[PDB]
Amino acid sequence: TYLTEEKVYEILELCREREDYSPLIRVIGRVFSSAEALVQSFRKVSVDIDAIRRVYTRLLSNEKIETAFLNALVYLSPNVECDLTYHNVYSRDPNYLNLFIIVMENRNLHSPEYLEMALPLFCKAMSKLPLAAQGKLIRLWSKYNADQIRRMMETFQQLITYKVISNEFNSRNLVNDDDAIVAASKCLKMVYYANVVGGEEDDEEPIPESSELTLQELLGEERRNKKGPRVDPLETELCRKPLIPFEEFINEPLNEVLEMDKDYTFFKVETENKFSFMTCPFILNAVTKNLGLYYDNRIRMYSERRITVLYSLVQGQQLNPYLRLKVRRDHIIDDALVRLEMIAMENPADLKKQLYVEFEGEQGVDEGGVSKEFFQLVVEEIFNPDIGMFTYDESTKLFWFNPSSFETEGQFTLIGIVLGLAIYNNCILDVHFPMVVYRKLMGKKGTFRDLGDSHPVLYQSLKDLLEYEGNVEDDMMITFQISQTDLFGNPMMYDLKENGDKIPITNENRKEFVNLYSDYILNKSVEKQFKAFRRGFHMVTNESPLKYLFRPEEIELLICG
Amino acid sequence: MFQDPQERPRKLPQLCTELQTTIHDIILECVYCKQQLLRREVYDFAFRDLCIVYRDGNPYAVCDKCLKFYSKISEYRHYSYSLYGTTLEQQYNKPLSDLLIRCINCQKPLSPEEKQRHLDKKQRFHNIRGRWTGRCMSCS
Amino acid sequence: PSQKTYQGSYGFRLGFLHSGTAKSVTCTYSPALNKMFCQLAKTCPVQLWVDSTPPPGTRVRAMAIYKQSQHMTEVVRRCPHHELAPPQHLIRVERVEYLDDRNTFRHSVVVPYEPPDCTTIHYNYMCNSSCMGGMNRRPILTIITLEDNLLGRNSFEVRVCACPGRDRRTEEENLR
Ligand SMILES: [Zn+2]
Ligand SMILES: [Zn+2]
Ligand SMILES: [Zn+2]
């Protein structure tokens, strides 16, 4: 039975000529209940998804046909679930994915009729798909429009919501051993990556180690080590803007029945029949992601405490279990920079302890408030105009680096370390940084499209130059050598080309002129300052899953609150 | 003696043959505690496939105590996640006999009977500092 | 017959698969003995690691000599019993070139180097380490030279015996 358009139509008018649709019901029941037939069915003249949509349009108006579809999907699903696992077919048949892109066109998947037993079974059968098949399917889905991605999103959001509402989840019955929610979210991962795909880079350098480096010399792992629990369905395909906003995947009914105390366990030690809902972190709320990061960064503190206990045991050494600063209140930068420099030199992995920062001249037990006080003191004194490190756009109330700040490289490293320690041990600050800062931290340079946050008064001028329909060569005569004036009154004419002051702008050169001017404004003017800033930020949170759990858009929420 | 950067013997038997000696007639200094190593310690350093560490042109071994101690320190400090043997096989697209998995306390590479003992007993291989480690039967 | 280890400008070194001391294993490696035990006409996995990628045209050359001082002066000839493989080249690799010296007549198995985390070359040995007329229980050193002219060298003793399981354990326990 090689179904096509013509077989379905011929059976359809044969049914309506006898005024009874029993042949269509029996055909649809016996063909859509077999995995072998749909793989060879509906092939192009290797599958005509538009023609499947046409068949569904011309067919799904009858209730008997659609309930036959439901029961046939119920029959189809478990014999494919126990086929990808106990056997393997996609390796010997690339056509097998046809099965999963003919039943997905069913508009009644996004309906309560398929919610109870059809869709859980189908998403369980699809959850065990091999990684290459998942990559091909995500690549296929990425070309779909926004409404179809929203439909595939809500198809599994409905199932997760229904299976969370309908199932009572105490601490003894978790969401990790409920295969319906696990399969639905592991199939929603495909829709999330299809949204990512269908919707400029930094130069990272890591930090060394003192004693473990000699061990790395011993084992021979000295060239370059690897780091990151990064997902399996990546490096099969490709940071960018999505087709549907990333907040839409945040499943709120699931996020209030999770247990990150137990979920972090299955994230750091991989139990077989227990899914860890940070492998799919896009369904994690802000409080849930922050909770998981908090558990990770407290387990690291306990590991460093145990390391110092061992050093107390064998060698007899006495080591401080905290990052015990001692800053005089009259000089916070001058007395925190030197301590952080000393600790960064002698023991680079000592900044991954609990921060204890007490002031001289006063005795305080650090229950958390004293570290907080140190933090607003730092944010006050770093961001003041007297130190001359950050300028303050009052039209947007945003703090952006100074292109004319020199010999403060250590202090930019200090504020980077302040943000790193802030994220590390659960501290919230008041930093008014543009989002280009929170992306340039993660490893992505800033594009002209994000000059609207940092410098809006100049971004508007650049955009008005971009779509200016008249000839730009004879109207403003702006050269490639830009005209920027320092706060000192001196000009700081910067060069974007070898003959910038001799090459006039043209109606074609403006497109790259804008994207070199933006590059100079927010990548090259502040290159030393941000290099120091990002090194300071990285040296505290280099072993953290923050690049894995937290998107750049949801890190301003982590520091600023 | 071996102050040349790109001329020096990396492991113990190469060090023995370029020093006109044997593995039975060598005295070696631990790179951590700067103490001499006994016969069983240079034998274990040979069996564990550990590189000779060169400081100021002098070749250095590691005794048992410093090896186990700093391996434990690095286990605490740089642990990433524990994966199953079957998960490792399906992830790396290679059998466990084609992957380098060292012991987690003594850094002896695992013979395939030890990896099969991990697979049969449903134990996990731990990622420490980007390298996979298990547990040999000597340390289990 | 220069067996001296040379990491080279690119950090050339040799790795091997710790294939255990099984009764049924065909090839095994011992780092203490630095010996690659093997079975006649079976797989020999030798991994090549470099710190930096050499320029293309890099020649991984395998040359077998004798380990003993008095025996380095004459070449490892193929066993007269076996004289698709040529009857003169001992080490086999499973496009590959083969060279013989013009004065001392040494068989060098030359393969163009290919980047991958380790270039795993499969070698094969065709006579036993107890053949008559050839080795006659003479230990052999296989030298793997990453040379384009040298950019790196390493070496390892080789035994080709009846079973690489019993003799590896026996030799390691005679060492200890
Ligand atoms: Zn020692
Ligand atoms: Zn061990
Ligand atoms: Zn022979």
Q: What is the CATH number of the domain that holds C141?
A: 2.60.40.720
Query: Are A3 and A31 in a shared domain?
Result: yes
Asked if residues A129 and A187 have their Cβ atoms less than 8 Å apart, the reply is: no
Tell me which residues of chain B have a C-beta less than 8 Å from any C-beta of chain A: 10, 31-32, 50-51, 53, 62, 67, 69-74, 76-84, 87, 91, 102, 107, 124, 129-131
Nearest CA in chain A to B130: A226
> What distances in angstroms separate CA A240 from CA A286, A418, A437, one per listed residue?
21, 28, 16
**Closest partner residue to B70 among A215, A229, A349, by Cβ?**
A215
Cβ–Cβ pairs < 8 A, chains B and C: 57
Query: Are A118 and A256 in a shared domain?
Result: no
- φ and ψ of C99, to 5 deg: -125, 150
DSSP SS3 for C60:
strand
Asked if residues A28 and A75 have their Cβ atoms less than 8 Å apart, the reply is: no
Query: Are A118 and A157 in a shared domain?
Result: no
Q: How far apart are the first and last CA of chain C?
A: 29
> Do the domain assignments include residue A136?
yes
Alpha-carbon radius of gyration of chain A: 30
| Distance from C-alpha of C4 to C-alpha of B18, rounded to nearest angstrom | 7
8-state DSSP, A528: H
| Distance from C-alpha of A521 to C-alpha of A514, rounded to nearest angstrom | 10
Query: Are A109 and A158 in a shared domain?
Result: no
CA of B14 to the centre of ligand 2 (A): 24
- Tell me whether residues B10 and C18 touch, CB distance under 8 A: no
Q: Long-range pairs for A196-200 at CB < 8 Å and ≥24 separation?
A: A196/A240, A196/A242, A197/A138, A197/A139, A197/A142, A197/A237, A197/A238, A198/A141, A198/A142, A198/A143, A198/A144, A198/A149, A198/A243, A199/A240, A199/A241, A199/A242, A199/A243, A199/A244, A200/A444, A200/A445, A200/A446, A200/A447
Query: Are A136 and A281 in a shared domain?
Result: yes
- φ and ψ of C66, to 5 deg: -90, 150
CA triplet C160, C161, C165: central angle to 5 degrees? 110
> Do the domain assignments include residue C6?
no
| Of A130, A28, A11, residue with least CA distance to A73 | A28
Residue A378's CB is within 10 A of a number of other CB atoms, namely 23
| Of B26, B15, B27, B18, residue with least CA distance to B51 | B15
Joined tokens for residue C49? 């690691």
CA of B64 to the centre of ligand 1 (A): 7
Report the relative pairing of strands B58-61 and B29-30 from DSSP bridges.
Answer: parallel
DSSP SS3 for B9:
coil
Residue span of the structural domain in which A164 resides: 130-198+232-285
Asked if residues A74 and A118 have their Cβ atoms less than 8 Å apart, the reply is: yes
Q: Method used for this model?
A: cryo-EM
Facing residues of C141 across strands? C65, C157
Residue A272's CB is within 10 A of a number of other CB atoms, namely 9
- Burial class of residue C164 (count of CB atoms within 10 Å of its CB; 0-12, 13-18, 19+): buried
Query: Are A104 and A161 in a shared domain?
Result: no
| Distance from C-alpha of C149 to C-alpha of A239, rounded to nearest angstrom | 45
Residues of chain C neighbouring B109 (CB-CB closer than 8 A) = 18
Q: What is the distance in angstroms between the Cα of B133 and the nearest Cα belonging to chain C?
A: 14
Closest ligand to Cα C127: 3
> Do the domain assignments include residue A465?
no
> Do the domain assignments include residue A63?
yes
- φ and ψ of A226, to 5 deg: -105, 155
C127 in a labelled binding site: yes
Q: What is the dihedral of CA A495, A500, A501, A504, to 10 degrees?
A: -150
In one letter, which amino acid is A377? L
Report the relative pairing of strands C27-30 and C97-100 from DSSP bridges.
Answer: unpaired
> Do the domain assignments include residue C2?
no
Joined tokens for residue A288? 């849930």
| Distance from C-alpha of A155 to C-alpha of A175, rounded to nearest angstrom | 19
**The domain boundary residue, chosen from A285, A302, A319:** A285
| Of C50, C81, C42, C79, residue with least CA distance to C64 | C79
Report the relative pairing of strands B131-134 and B102-103 from DSSP bridges.
Answer: parallel
Joined tokens for residue A557? 């929420």
Residue C59's CB is within 10 A of a number of other CB atoms, namely 18
Asked if residues B134 and B115 have their Cβ atoms less than 8 Å apart, the reply is: yes
CA of B102 to the centre of ligand 2 (A): 8
Query: Are A50 and A84 in a shared domain?
Result: yes
- What angle in degrees, to the nearest 10, is found between the helix axes of B39-47 and C166-175? 150
Asked if residues A244 and A149 have their Cβ atoms less than 8 Å apart, the reply is: yes
> Do the domain assignments include residue C63?
yes
> Do the domain assignments include residue C88?
yes
Residues of chain A neighbouring C11 (CB-CB closer than 8 A) = 223
CA A549 to chain CA mean position, Å: 6
In A280-380, the DSSP E strands lie at 322-327, 354-359
> Do the domain assignments include residue A294?
no
Asked if residues B15 and B50 have their Cβ atoms less than 8 Å apart, the reply is: no
In one letter, which amino acid is C15? G
A18 Cβ contact list (under 8 Å, min separation 6) = none
Q: Which residues of C68-85 are buried (b: 16+ CB within 10 A; e: fewer)?
A: eeeeeeebbbbbeeeeee
Number of domains in chain C: 1
- Tell me whether residues A304 and B87 touch, CB distance under 8 A: no
DSSP SS3 for C146:
strand
Query: Are A143 and A278 in a shared domain?
Result: yes
> What distances in angstroms separate CA A115 from CA A109, A261, B57, one per listed residue?
7, 30, 71
DSSP SS3 for B30:
strand
- Tell me whether residues A217 and B74 touch, CB distance under 8 A: no
> Do the domain assignments include residue C25?
yes
Report the relative pairing of strands C119-125 and C91-93 from DSSP bridges.
Answer: antiparallel
Facing residues of A485 across strands? A491
CA of B3 to the centre of ligand 1 (A): 22
| Distance from C-alpha of C60 to C-alpha of C114, rounded to nearest angstrom | 10
> Do the domain assignments include residue A323?
no
> Do the domain assignments include residue A261?
yes
**The domain boundary residue, chosen from A262, A285, A308:** A285
Q: Long-range pairs for A542-546 at CB < 8 Å and ≥24 separation?
A: A542/A206, A542/A207, A542/A227, A543/A227, A543/A300, A543/A352, A543/B78, A544/A293, A544/A296, A544/A297, A544/A423, A544/A424, A545/A229, A545/A278, A545/A292, A545/A293, A545/A296, A546/A293, A546/A423
> What distances in angstroms separate CA A410 from CA A377, A441, A522, one per listed residue?
18, 17, 20
> Do the domain assignments include residue C75?
yes
Query: Are A97 and A174 in a shared domain?
Result: no
* Torsion sign over Cα C100, C106, C107, C110: negative
- Gap sites in chain A (C to N > 2.5 Å), preceding residue numbers: 45, 199, 238
Residues of chain A neighbouring C51 (CB-CB closer than 8 A) = 223
| Distance from C-alpha of C33 to C-alpha of C171, rounded to nearest angstrom | 8
Domains and CATH numbers, chain B: 12-62 (3.30.240.40), 72-134 (3.30.240.40)
Enclosing H/E stretch for A160: helix A146-166
Query: Are A135 and A281 in a shared domain?
Result: yes
| Distance from C-alpha of A195 to C-alpha of A189, rounded to nearest angstrom | 10
Number of domains in chain A: 2
> Do the domain assignments include residue C134?
yes
Facing residues of C97 across strands? C110
Query: Are A147 and A87 in a shared domain?
Result: no
CA triplet B21, B24, B25: central angle to 5 degrees? 45
Enclosing H/E stretch for A525: none
8-state DSSP, A458: H
- φ and ψ of A288, to 5 deg: -75, -45
Q: What is the distance in angstroms between the Cα of A442 and the nearest Cα belonging to chain C?
A: 27
Resolution for the entry shown, Å: 3.4
**The domain boundary residue, chosen from A255, A285, A315:** A285
Beta sheet of B58-61, edge-to-edge order: B29-30, B58-61, B53-55
> Do the domain assignments include residue C84?
yes
Asked if residues A95 and A154 have their Cβ atoms less than 8 Å apart, the reply is: no
8-state DSSP, A524: I
Residue span of the structural domain in which C118 resides: 13-175
CA B54 to chain CA mean position, Å: 16
DSSP SS3 for C50:
coil
> What distances in angstroms separate CA C11 from CA A70, A462, A517, C144, C149, one per listed residue?
63, 50, 43, 14, 15
Q: What is the distance in angstroms between the Cα of C113 and the nearest Cα belonging to chain A?
A: 20
C104 Cβ contact list (under 8 Å, min separation 6) = C75
